[PDB]
Each structure stands twice: as C-alpha cells, then as structure tokens.
Amino acid sequence: ERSKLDLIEEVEPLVRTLGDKLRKSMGRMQRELDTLQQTYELNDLRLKKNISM
C-alpha cells in the first residue's frame, strides 16, 4: 500500500505534471513544425523562381 500511495500521490502528480509539460512541448514542436514548413515554402518558391529567371 505504501508503493501504491507513492504511485498515486508521488508518481501520479509527477506523471500528470510531466504530461502537461510534454503536451506543452508537443505544442512547441508542432509550432516549430509549421514554422519550418513555412520556411520550406519560402526556400522552395525562391529556388523555383530564381531558376525560372
């Protein structure tokens, strides 16, 4: 029961806090993702245009 109490009042709050932090980090990296995609579109258009003329 002491191990269970660690799981639900020590490991459980730790894992919930890790869950919120990792979900905020997932949001962080999908914003890194779409900003890197937007730079991708920038370089792709710049390359295609400059090669075009």
Partner 1 sequence: IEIEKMEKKINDSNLLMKTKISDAEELVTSTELKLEELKVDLNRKRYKL
**Contact pattern for partner 1 over residues 16 through 45, marking x by CB under 8 A:** ----------------------x--xx--x
Q: Does residue 53 sit in helix, strand or coil?
A: coil
C-alpha 31/C-alpha 23 separation (Å) is 12
Number of residues that bind partner 1 (CB under 8 A): 8
Measured from the CB atom, the residue of 2 and 49 that comes closer to partner 1 is 49
Nearer to partner 1, 29 or 53 (CB): 53
